[PDB]
Amino acid sequence: GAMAPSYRVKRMDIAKNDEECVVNAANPRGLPGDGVCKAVYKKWPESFKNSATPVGTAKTVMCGTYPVIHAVGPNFSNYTESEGDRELAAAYREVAKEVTRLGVNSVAIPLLSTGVYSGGKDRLTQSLNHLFTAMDSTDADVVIYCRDKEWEKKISEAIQMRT
Numbered sequence: 001g002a003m004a005p006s007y008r009v010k011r012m013d014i015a016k017n018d019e020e021c022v023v024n025a026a027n028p029r030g031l032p033g034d035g036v037c038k039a040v041y042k043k044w045p046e047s048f049k050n051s052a053t054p055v056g057t058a059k060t061v062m063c064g065t066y067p068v069i070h071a072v073g074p075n076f077s078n079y080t081e082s083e084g085d086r087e088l089a090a091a092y093r094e095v096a097k098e099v100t101r102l103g104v105n106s107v108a109i110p111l112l113s114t115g116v117y118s119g120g121k122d123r124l125t126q127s128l129n130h131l132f133t134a135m136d137s138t139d140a141d142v143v144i145y146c147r148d149k150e151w152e153k154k155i156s157e158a159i160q161m162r163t
């Protein structure tokens with residue numbers, strides 16, 4: 001466990017994280033993909049061996065001794081708002097189980113379903129709130145990675161509002 005488990009946000013490539021494991025915003029088929037998934041494929045390509053897993057699940061594959069947790073958020077282009085919301089909640093619950101199983105003291109995590117899988121909507125608050133519901137009961141340091149300057153500000157304010 002971390003000595004005083006914390007949330008932090010950084011605006012940078014998750015492939016340069018300083019944490020003990022990474023969460024990939026994966027597709028269900030274990031393909032190289034785009035955005036976070038493409039950066040993760042370039043940095044840890046060995047982790048894509050048998051990484052296919054269903055929507056709403058997470059599957060960990062080791063790159064050497066470094067764990068890559070492939071977490072599959074719903075594509076809101078295909079899911080109803082209702083079903084998509086349930087699968088996005090479920091994907092983060094499976095990340096919390098894997099983080100706990102691995103015994104890591106820190107994890108790098110992107111906001112699932114907020115890019116190509118967003119169905120054209122702003123899902124910062126929806127995705128971040130499902131991240132908190134899952135990770136609040138874990139004692140790993142959680143470092144959230146984003147690329148937009150306005151998103152960094154809003155994530156930081158959300159963390160600070162809980163004090």
Ligand SMILES: NC(=O)c1cc(Cl)ccc1N
Pocket residue numbers: 012013014015035036039110111115145146147
């Ligand atoms: N590689 C990343 O950290 C990243 C890339 C995109 Cl396009 C969006 C969010 C991210 N965290």
Ligand SMILES: [Cl-]
Pocket residue numbers: 011012013016
């Ligand atoms: Cl960067």
Ligand SMILES: [Cl-]
Pocket residue numbers: 025112113114115116117118
């Ligand atoms: Cl996405």
Ligand SMILES: [Cl-]
Pocket residue numbers: 146147148151
């Ligand atoms: Cl972002």
